[PDB]
Amino acid sequence: KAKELREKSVEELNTELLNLLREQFNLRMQAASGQLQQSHLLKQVRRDVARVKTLLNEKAGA
Amino acid sequence: MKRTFQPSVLKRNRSHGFRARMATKNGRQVLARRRAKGRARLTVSK
Amino acid sequence: AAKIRRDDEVIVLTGKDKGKRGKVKNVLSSGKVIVEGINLVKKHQKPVPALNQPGGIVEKEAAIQVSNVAIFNAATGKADRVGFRFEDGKKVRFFKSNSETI
Amino acid sequence: SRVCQVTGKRPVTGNNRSHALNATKRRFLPNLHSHRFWVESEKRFVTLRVSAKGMRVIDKKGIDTVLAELRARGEKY
């Protein structure tokens, strides 16, 4: 998924990162209350957050 | 009867703790020895 | 690469099921394969009140060493050996006996 | 430390020997003195801790030559 993210701009990456963090929080609430059946989604959003932060770091010349 | 071990955490740390060991070259050689032996607990420091 | 793959049709070389034929259902990283209908064992399954409880004596396949089976050459009707070669830039398997691609 | 700033003389170890030749460890110390040396070229006195031998070296070579040696060695005065 790093290819499609690499097209977006720094400002689009920051909006995407925020959206993932909200999703990660909602999943965390559902998991804790026992209302999450698809536990595999937790790892998925966690690694997506890492992908976005890596690209934000690559674009800053870092 | 009063026995020899009368615990006090402040005295324990001042006498044998990590920073007391680091304060002298002889104390740093204690730490070097215990690291070479591979101790899991280097000092009394909790 | 692996000479025996899942869904291959194999024939058993050694053991109580020597000479029998089946299809590879599972390849285990320990060098063993589950072959359909072959190395059958009778498991005394205790009932599990958590889910459904069909606790009884179940028959099921046990893993067998992968060197104890051979790829089955249906043309010759015999066990064969596998080689590797490159055709059209891709690596393929072929029967050692008649040199045909698997 | 008991070290001559001009020559680098410092304590050395050796033995006391008795008539029966019993050896006991001892030191030999340098003959050090703090002395104010007049530096004509800078119109001031510089105090050095020097052995009597070092004072003879300064008499021979001149305080300016000696002080240049000290600056080369990084020895502050």
Partner: protein, 93 residues
């Protein structure tokens, strides 16, 4: 402002227990598991933004983890932070 990225990390889970349930229906107080380094001010801002309720006051405490055996092996669970979050009257979570 506390940044939204920080606010999204401080609340970990609701805390379910008899004392927590009694706290909710008797004093309008919800009990949360929060990040170990969260402050009372961070918890207050996160609840107000993410749960969309008005908070009166936050009380906190640190729960020390228990030593447990597991097949001879000895271990220790992690310390965690509990927050009693009193909501303003009329609010409902």
């Amino acid at each position: 402002m506390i940044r939204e990225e920080r606010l999204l990390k401080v609340l970990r889970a609701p805390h379910v227990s008899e004392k927590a349930s009694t706290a909710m229906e008797k004093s309008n107080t919800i009990v949360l598991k929060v990040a170990k380094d969260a402050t009372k001010a961070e918890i207050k801002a996160a609840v107000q933004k993410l749960f969309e309720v008005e908070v009166e006051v936050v009380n906190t405490l640190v729960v020390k983890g228990k030593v447990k055996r597991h097949g001879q092996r000895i271990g220790r669970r992690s310390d965690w932070k509990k927050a009693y979050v009193t909501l303003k009257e009329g609010q409902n979570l």
